[PDB]
Design a protein around this nucleic acid. Structure first.
Lengths: 63, 386, 132
RNA sequence: CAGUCAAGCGUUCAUAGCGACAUUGCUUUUUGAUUCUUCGAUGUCGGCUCUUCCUAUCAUACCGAAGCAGAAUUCGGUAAGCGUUGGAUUGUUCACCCACUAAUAGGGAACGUGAGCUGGGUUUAGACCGUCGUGAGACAGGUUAGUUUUACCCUACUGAUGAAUGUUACCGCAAUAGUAAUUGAACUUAGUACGAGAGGAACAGUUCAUUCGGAUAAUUGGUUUUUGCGGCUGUCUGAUCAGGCAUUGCCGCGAAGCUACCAUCCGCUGGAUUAUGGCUGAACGCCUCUAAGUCAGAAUCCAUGCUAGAACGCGGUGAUUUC
RNA sequence: UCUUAAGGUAGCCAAAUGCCUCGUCAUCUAAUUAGUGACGCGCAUGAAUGGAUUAACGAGAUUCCCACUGUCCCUAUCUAC
RNA sequence: UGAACAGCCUCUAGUUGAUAGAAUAAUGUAGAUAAGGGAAGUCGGCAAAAUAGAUCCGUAACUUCGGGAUAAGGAUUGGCU
């Protein structure tokens, strides 16, 4: 039951939920809410979305 | 003419009529067979359904795909405060059936149970069981004759019990009254146990234990008037049909010139007392100690209650029981648990359960964090906290 | 089947055109017949993450058509839940050519393959890439 | 459709499986014969949806017979508890083809069902083609389009109140009435029994799975009037913030509720019996499952279990109006 | 040779015209009484009682293909009245 | 706004006239949404949905040379300087 990391924003995957969507080359992405998966669906490019832990380390917010 | 394409019938022919129950608390119609060799104990308990969470257990069954491996399932938690015995009922056996011989009650009656006999408590004069308490003044001889009568006659003896409702988050203030039947020992032993427990409370640990088969009785949730499509599950009419499509196209034939009772018809769905068989107890918790939601593998200091408490019910502070699968009835609905009548040995009942992980996340949406410490650690400093 | 695969969740019913991913020359598979199901009035038989399903091709090799012929599906589109508790759904519903026993007509499949398919018929798992 | 006889098929051999030449019957799911009911009017085909009933039983359960070595297959008995599909063409009822499964058994209920629906055909009026007829017109010959009205009243059903038995409230019993679960695959058995080999099991244990039913929404999807938030377009309030309208202005996320074999859990064992196989035992000094009694035994019946509780079935218990 | 006028010429077709017919062959399909192209001793096609191709067009009828969608698998939810 | 007297909002002017209120059950009338399949339902793509404006390249068979044609099929569309 070890916790995973979300593949869109960066979170803590607890057993029970998650989406894969794969790619074809088997990158194996894991999401945590419908919001994150839906945001990935239209290629929102999580290099620009704001409220992100990925942004929390990239944009140097809350260090 | 014969049916063009035969199909299985819709709905059950053993659950009619689908009508409202006579009381909010579903009554029990069967009790475990009495064996006068075991020590006397209760065969049923009362509890209010609180909610369900997610737990992780071990899949231990030879022949399965994975052995000694993790798995997830749903488990319903019911808040069952310890019950207080207020009397016993002696049932004599007659050729026409069981008959109630006599009833004996306690000297001191709590306000919660006494409120059950009143419909307007504030306007009432609280003159309930007043002259009855005078029977115990001199030596209590007013019931010793009745006690001897219950000892001699009334081969079937059952104990009348009530719950303490001031310890639950529900703002109801009226104890629910049900009937509990004694199994084990002789009639004299059962009545002695009943009389020695007068004005006393008993814990749920003495009536239920881990790794047993437990059945649940409760009334379901009503939904009002509903057409046949969801009440029974019949095929809806096509779009091109006239005067609507959500009904039964044919309800019978010319002969007989009446509508068949087995024909699905629009009516009431829900709020029916229902019986759930083979529910497995996973763990029984105590309300007087912490680590309710902490297991041996996961020693995180947390309680069974999720973030912000259970939805529409509140928090858990008394004894709670979590059982595999869904329980009939919605939250805050009274559920009276009943032990398994038949000794199901088989293989699905002898396994040993070992809880690993307890989900205490926010069920009020899509919460992730389990404990405030984890949320603070992953969240850092805030603006609200100075 | 040398194993009892779990509860079936549908999503690939009869009348679906699904592509191919092996090296037999087949391109797309047209679902026409499914066994392992039962009988129900006005219920269209469907498929799941790996079933013994016959089909026919609609585009591709001129000789791989015009006859009923068995096939095996390796990828689905509807979300699938393993008992450990995970909602899995592959991007495109794809499958592999097969004989009634489970033998190969091509050489190797392309792309990933479900672990349940590996626990099923083993010869497709033999000539597979990554399994997940 | 089912019985009787037997010249024969079955390498020899009548009932393993068939049986000509004939005969005795069965129901009205075909079509016939009459017109007794209806022409001051029973809405006429087919299909969709749905309930129940019958056995002349396709499969499941339990058994018997076979030229039954296994498997497979054929016939028969108890048997309606349960199931009996999805699709190309045709309006089709019929018929044919593809595939599945245990198999896709045969029928009725005003040729079930139009104040439930569909309107393709038939079966008005328009119009075309071919034949007959000088002709208007006919064609159980072909094609196209062609308004399918109404329930509020009575009964019945689904549910829901309800006065009266001293009132009220609680705990209750249980006559009645319904009932539910069905079926298959895989590992071990076992490449074993059997068979020479090719071939090839069954009963226990386990994993489950098809359909159906009862519940609940923790998890996932859907639903957006939470109009909750954010963004966008046209117009208006001097501009900004904050804003109105565009019949819910649009999009993304979207809490709660609801719901989804598109989600989860669950669907019990005791007795008595049918078919049939057995014991003792005469009639019939022997034999005999039967005449008396008696054993085992089916998805059969009844109880264990569940649902509603006679609103004129019943029991116990608290207080029962100082005015 | 005949009652007479000669016995269907050029064209077309199981076509809206074919009872036999779900005629036969090829193609479309896993499967087609559907569609298209041919075969014609064609009950009963046929040249101004007019035959064919027809360029463009038809709220005319039918068949096939791509995206599409609750028509369906399999039903669920919201709104105003 | 906008190619437009298309659709929408506002100015002058006119109206606030359709018996009302509280509840939000089924079945209904009207408007939409539904993961996967994509016509497998139905006599029949019936209804709904799908592309829809402007700019740039290109646009087939046939033909009476006029058409098919917006054929089919590809890229862009905001704001500020």
């Amino acid at each position: 039951m070890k916790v995973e990391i979300d593949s869109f924003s960066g979170a803590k995957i607890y057993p029970g939920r998650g989406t894969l969507f794969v790619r074809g080359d088997s990158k194996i992405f894991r999401f945590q809410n419908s919001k994150s998966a839906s945001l990935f669906k239209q290629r929102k490019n999580p290099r620009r979305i704001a409220w992100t832990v990925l942004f929390r380390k990239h944009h140097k917010k809350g260090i | 003419s014969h049916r063009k394409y035969e199909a299985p019938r819709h709905g059950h022919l053993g659950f009619l009529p689908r009508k409202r129950a006579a009381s909010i608390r579903a009554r029990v119609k069967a009790f475990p067979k009495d064996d006068r060799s075991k020590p006397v104990a209760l065969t049923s308990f009362l509890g209010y359904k609180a909610g369900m969470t997610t737990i992780v257990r071990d899949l231990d069954r030879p022949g399965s795909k994975f052995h000694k491996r993790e798995v997830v399932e749903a488990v319903t938690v019911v808040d069952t405060p310890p019950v207080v015995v207020v009397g016993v009922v002696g049932y004599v056996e007659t050729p026409r059936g069981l008959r109630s011989l006599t009833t004996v009650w306690a000297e001191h009656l709590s306000d919660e149970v006494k409120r059950r006999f009143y419909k307007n408590w504030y306007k009432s004069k609280k003159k309930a069981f007043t002259k009855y308490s005078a029977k115990y003044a001199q030596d209590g001889a007013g019931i010793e004759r009745e006690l001897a009568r219950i000892k001699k006659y009334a081969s079937v003896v059952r104990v009348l019990v009530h719950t303490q409702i001031r310890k639950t988050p529900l703002a109801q203030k009226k104890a629910h009254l049900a009937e509990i039947q004694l199994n084990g020992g002789s009639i004299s032993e059962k009545v002695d146990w009943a009389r020695e427990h007068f004005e006393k409370t008993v814990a749920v640990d003495s009536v239920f234990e881990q790794n047993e088969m437990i059945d649940a009785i409760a009334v379901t949730k009503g939904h009002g008037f509903e057409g046949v499509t969801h009440r029974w599950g019949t095929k809806k009419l096509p779009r091109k049909t006239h005067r609507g499509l959500r009904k039964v196209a044919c309800i019978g034939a010319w002969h007989p010139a009446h509508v068949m009772w087995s024909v699905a018809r629009a009516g009431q769905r829900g709020y029916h007392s229902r019986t759930s068989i083979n529910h497995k107890i996973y763990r029984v918790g105590k309300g007087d100690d912490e680590a309710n939601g902490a297991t041996s593998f996961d020693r995180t200091k947390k309680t069974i209650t999720p973030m912000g408490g259970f939805v529409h019910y509140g928090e858990i502070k008394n004894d709670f029981i979590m059982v595999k699968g869904c329980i009939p009835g919605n939250r805050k609905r009274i559920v009276t648990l009943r032990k398994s009548l038949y000794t199901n040995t088989s293989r699905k009942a002898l396994e040993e359960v070992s809880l690993k992980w307890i989900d205490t996340a926010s069920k009020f949406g899509k919460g992730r964090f389990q404990t405030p410490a984890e949320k603070h650690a992953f969240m850092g400093t805030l603006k609200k906290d100075l | 089947a040398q194993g009892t695969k779990f509860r079936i969740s549908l999503g690939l019913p009869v009348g679906a055109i699904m592509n191919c991913a092996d090296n037999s020359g087949a391109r797309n598979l047209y679902i026409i017949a499914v066994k392992g199901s039962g009988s129900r009035l006005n219920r269209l038989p469907a498929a799941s993450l790996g079933d013994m399903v016959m089909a026919t091709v609609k585009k591709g090799k001129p000789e791989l058509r015009k006859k009923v012929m068995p096939a095996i599906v390796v990828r689905q589109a509807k979300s699938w839940r393993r008992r450990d508790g995970v909602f899995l759904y592959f991007e495109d519903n794809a499958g592999v050519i097969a004989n009634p026993k489970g033998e190969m007509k091509g050489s190797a499949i392309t792309g990933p393959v479900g672990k349940e398919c590996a626990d099923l018929w083993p010869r497709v798992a033999s000539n597979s890439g990554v399994v997940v």
